[PDB]
Design a protein around this ligand. Structure first.
Ligand SMILES: CN(C)Cc1ccc(-c2cc3onc(-c4ccccc4Cl)c3c(=O)n2C)cc1
Length: 468
């Protein structure tokens, strides 16, 4: 994911592509903050293509909608031509880069939060590599920056700290007394104690910190390019709401027509899915039935900004309907401020004794773009959903959907996973928002779409702990 440059202007991108690139050379960069630009070189000229994400997907002008920037790039490199990634040498979005950090503060972080192999890189004009080895000691290796090249005092001269770090991660430096300076894992600094969320929120709200953390998490999406073959099959193309927003094969829900654009999310489990198409309503009820799901969370309106987001897959109040071999009665509709509750009874046609109540919680006030200004409403909604799920003996995974099932769906599931830790373990527990996001993202592409949603998750968690 070296083709992503986090701090460059359009003019900087043009000079990079014109003097250091060739025709087919490309880079992606953040632009209107919240938007992205794909800068491509074609016939000695640089073209700037806008990528927009309001929280649902990455919408590329002239192209398609995607779950990640790494998925967008992979698709266009495997299918204006993107031939050559122009690699960024800036270490800002690397998990191990700490910029300004003292040798005492870095030794303090590594002593408290570190283990064998924990390393970091910090900053006159030179850098320091601080590593922990044992079960124990902390070693500091100087990194000279000579003529825009990096070295440890001998041997190879690297063009970037990333190239130096990856080389010594594969071929570790051995101290001339036996110690192998193993660079196993970057030091974990994102994990906070639940009780100190307000201190972290304040630190991340400073010049912004939330953007710096979200973008470091985004640089790890390249490790999540898992196969999505079943969703690419001819027979399954029109079962997808967005052609390239597909479920991973290793986590996809298999129906025992075995396909649905849904994935199991394991932290209480979830099924993260897209908004129904008219041709997928029957597949959706077969999923709910097979998975013994008793609660559905819908986080979109049927129609948003004049576009359909999910077809009406449930009957009108008091009506009874058949969806293939599935049968749904809408027993009762209850309305609250932020949402609607629908009591549905699901059964298999011809088999009365298969009946179960399915509670549909439909959140109706999420803004068309961005996030709600206060997380109170979402939290009250998640609280009520949790209690319904917990009250039902041996209930299957909670079904969660929006339009593509990655943005709002990913936000709701992540808040819910985090809140759950605080329910069982209490205000005296460890919470790690990006580790948790990365974990859910390995189960469905691009779960949690924007920095606004990312900030919303911290704020939601902050509010839950405060109202305790
Ligand atoms: C403020 N600067 C100067 C210091 C600083 C602070 C925090 C980080 C940091 C940010 C991260 O954003 N996602 C992950 C992540 C990715 C994959 C898996 C798990 C995780 Cl936690 C992540 C991470 O690991 N680290 C360490 C890096 C540098």
């Amino acid at each position: 994911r070296r083709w992503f440059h986090p701090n460059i202007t359009g003019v900087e991108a043009e000079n990079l592509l014109l003097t250091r690139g060739v025709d087919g050379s490309f880079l992606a960069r953040p632009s209107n903050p919240g938007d992205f630009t794909l800068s491509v070189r074609r016939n000695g000229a640089v073209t700037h293509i806008k990528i927009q994400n309001t929280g649902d997907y990455y919408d590329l002008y002239g192209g398609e909608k995607f779950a990640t920037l790494a998925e967008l790039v992979q698709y266009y490199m495997e299918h204006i031509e993107l031939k050559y990634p122009l690699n960024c040498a800036d270490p800002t979005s690397e998990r191990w880069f700490h910029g300004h950090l003292s040798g005492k503060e870095a030794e303090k972080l590594l002593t408290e939060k570190g283990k064998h192999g924990s390393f970091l890189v910090r900053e006159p004009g030179d850098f320091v590599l601080s590593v922990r080895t044992g079960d124990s000691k902390v070693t500091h290796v100087m990194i000279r920056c000579q003529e825009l090249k990096y070295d440890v005092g001998g041997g190879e001269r690297f063009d970037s700290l990333t190239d130096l770090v990856e080389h010594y991660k594969k071929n570790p430096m051995v101290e001339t007394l036996g110690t192998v300076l193993q660079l196993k894992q970057p030091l974990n600094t994102t994990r906070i104690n639940a009780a100190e969320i307000e201190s972290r929120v304040r630190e991340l709200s400073k010049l912004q910190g939330f953007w710096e953390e979200f973008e470091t998490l985004q640089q790890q999406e390249c490790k999540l390019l898992y196969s999505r073959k079943e969703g690419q099959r001819q027979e399954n193309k029109n079962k997808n709401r967005y052609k390239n927003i597909l479920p991973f094969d290793h986590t996809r829900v298999v129906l025992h027509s075995d396909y649905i654009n849904a994935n199991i999310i394991m932290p209480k489990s979830y099924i993260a899915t897209q908004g129904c198409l008219q041709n997928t309503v029957n597949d959706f009820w077969r999923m709910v039935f097979q998975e013994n799901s008793r609660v559905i969370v819908m986080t979109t309106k049927e129609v948003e900004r004049g576009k359909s987001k999910c077809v009406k897959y449930w009957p009108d109040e008091y009506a009874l309907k058949e969806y293939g071999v599935m049968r749904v009665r809408n027993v009762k509709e209850s309305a609250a401020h932020d949402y609607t509750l629908r009591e549905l009874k699901l059964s298999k046609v011809g088999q009365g004794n298969t009946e179960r109540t399915v509670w549909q919680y439909h959140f109706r006030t999420w803004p068309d773009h961005g996030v709600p200004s206060d997380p109170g409403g979402v939290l009250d909604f998640l609280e009520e959903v949790h209690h319904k799920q917990e009250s039902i003996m041996d209930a299957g995974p909670v079904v969660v959907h929006c339009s593509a099932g990655i943005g709002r769906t990913g936000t709701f599931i992540v808040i819910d996973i985090l809140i759950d830790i605080i329910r069982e373990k209490g205000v005296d527990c460890d919470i790690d928002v990006p580790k948790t996001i990365q974990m859910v993202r390995s189960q469905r592409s691009g779960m949690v779409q924007t920095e606004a949603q990312y900030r919303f998750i911290y704020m939601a968690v902050q509010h839950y702990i405060e109202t305790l």
